[PDB]
Amino acid sequence: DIQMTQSPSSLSASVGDRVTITCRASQNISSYLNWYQQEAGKAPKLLIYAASSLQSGVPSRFSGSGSGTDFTLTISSLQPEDFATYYCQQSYSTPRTFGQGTKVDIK
Amino acid sequence: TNLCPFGEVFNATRFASVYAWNRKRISNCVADYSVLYNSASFSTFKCYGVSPTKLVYADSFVIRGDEVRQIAPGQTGKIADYNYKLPFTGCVIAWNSNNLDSKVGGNYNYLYRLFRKSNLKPFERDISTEIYQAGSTPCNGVEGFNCYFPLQSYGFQPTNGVGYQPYRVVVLSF
Amino acid sequence: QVQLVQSGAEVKKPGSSVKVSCKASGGTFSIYAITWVRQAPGQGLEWMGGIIPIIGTANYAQKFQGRVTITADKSTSTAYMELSSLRSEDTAVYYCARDFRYCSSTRCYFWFDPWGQGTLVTVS
Ligand SMILES: *[C@@H]1O[C@H](CO)[C@@H](O[C@@H]2O[C@H](CO)[C@@H](O)[C@H](O)[C@H]2NC(C)=O)[C@H](O)[C@H]1NC(C)=O
Ligand SMILES: *[C@@H]1O[C@H](CO)[C@@H](O)[C@H](O)[C@H]1NC(C)=O
């Protein structure tokens, strides 16, 4: 299977700060990485797909870059509505692989 | 004195999708084709080898507008090469069905082949769901990761440009 | 517009079975794929398996082979899953999604947009 490594496991930040999250696979997969946000009590939703495109309509709060084995997600200016967990999925195998997940915390 | 059900061929409640075509044979029928020729409801009425004023296998399906020109001998493209390959003598008749097929939210009852192992032979109808192998390694049942599900759907909807309008196409081969 | 609507919580005890489902709207029911994922309280999210109804054979993760049946009903446009031989460690929220893909040229990319609500099963 594909090992999806997601870190830091904890990213505190203030509102208006920047958040950087790393999603690296042990395998070189050119562009199948997706990022999801999960709010408390809810099913997860997609933010970013196929490495860098947005789906949610979010006003450029999330963006990122990289290819093959690596990838970096950045939060451009963290807002109150973003205090949610995040996780990576690499859509390149059966089973699909998910990372362990991370969260953005508060001061 | 005995005109056949051209009306069933044309005024079908539902049309076949490319990939899963409705092949009807017409025999023992008056060839009154003035009914199609003089009808203003049709747009394309391109006759090959036959005069349209003098003019059977009736192959019907729904295609998007940019691809209408592919239903012809000598053509290439997603439909001409992977769905419906034509060699022919007869006419290709088509009309804009936007008011029949374009549903709100999108009409997703039509499906076309995008990924194929080889170019189709004339009138070959491949109706299988076999997974496209891409070429780097056998899929072995894996989902589409540099491996592909062979067909893509195509939705039709009320707001579209010309190339995105659905067309009902009937190919009458003689 | 493939909104998925899924069933609520269930409590059947270990040794029995739990069947859950998600009804799909929008269209193109037969392709792309119905997949199920689960997560325990604590987001140890994993793929269980899924099915492309036009083929109808499914593909399962090694953790659920022989335990979970994933199927689909084309006329009901509904996703189904049933876990047999229930255990207390199976407590999780189960989710549906459609494996939507976008294709261009010779490559397609896959992601999950139409997430359901989550069905909580607590066999205890
Ligand atoms: C499909 O149905 C339409 C009716 O909606 C048929 O159109 C009629 O055809 C007759 C015979 O030429 C005309 O006298 C009528 O005035 C037409 N009515 C309308 C509303 O167009 C059409 O001929 C049928 N198609 C085929 C191939 O038989
Ligand atoms: C990673 O994938 C790209 C695109 O498929 C390829 O060009 C590159 O050589 C690969 N790199 C490694 C280390 O496998």
Author numbering:
A (entry chain L): 1 to 107
B (entry chain C): 333 to 387, 395 to 426, 429 to 515
C (entry chain H): 1 to 52, 52A, 53 to 82, 82A, 82B, 82C, 83 to 100, 100A, ...
Per the authors:
Mutations in the ACE2 receptor binding site on the surface S protein have been shown to disrupt antibody binding and prevent viral neutralization. The protective mechanisms for the coronavirus disease 2019 (COVID-19) vaccines are still being deduced, however, several analyses have found that the elicitation of neutralizing antibodies (nAbs) correlates with protection (Feng et al., 2021; McMahan et al., 2021), a finding consistent with many other successful antiviral vaccines. nAbs have been identified that target several distinct epitopes on the S trimer, but the majority of nAbs target the receptor binding domain (RBD) (Barnes et al., 2020; Piccoli et al., 2020). In each complex, we used a stabilized, uncleaved Spike trimer (HPM7) based on the Wuhan strain containing 6 proline (hexaproline or HP) mutations (Hsieh et al., 2020) and an engineered interprotomer disulfide (mut7 or M7) between residues 705 and 883 of the S2 subunit.
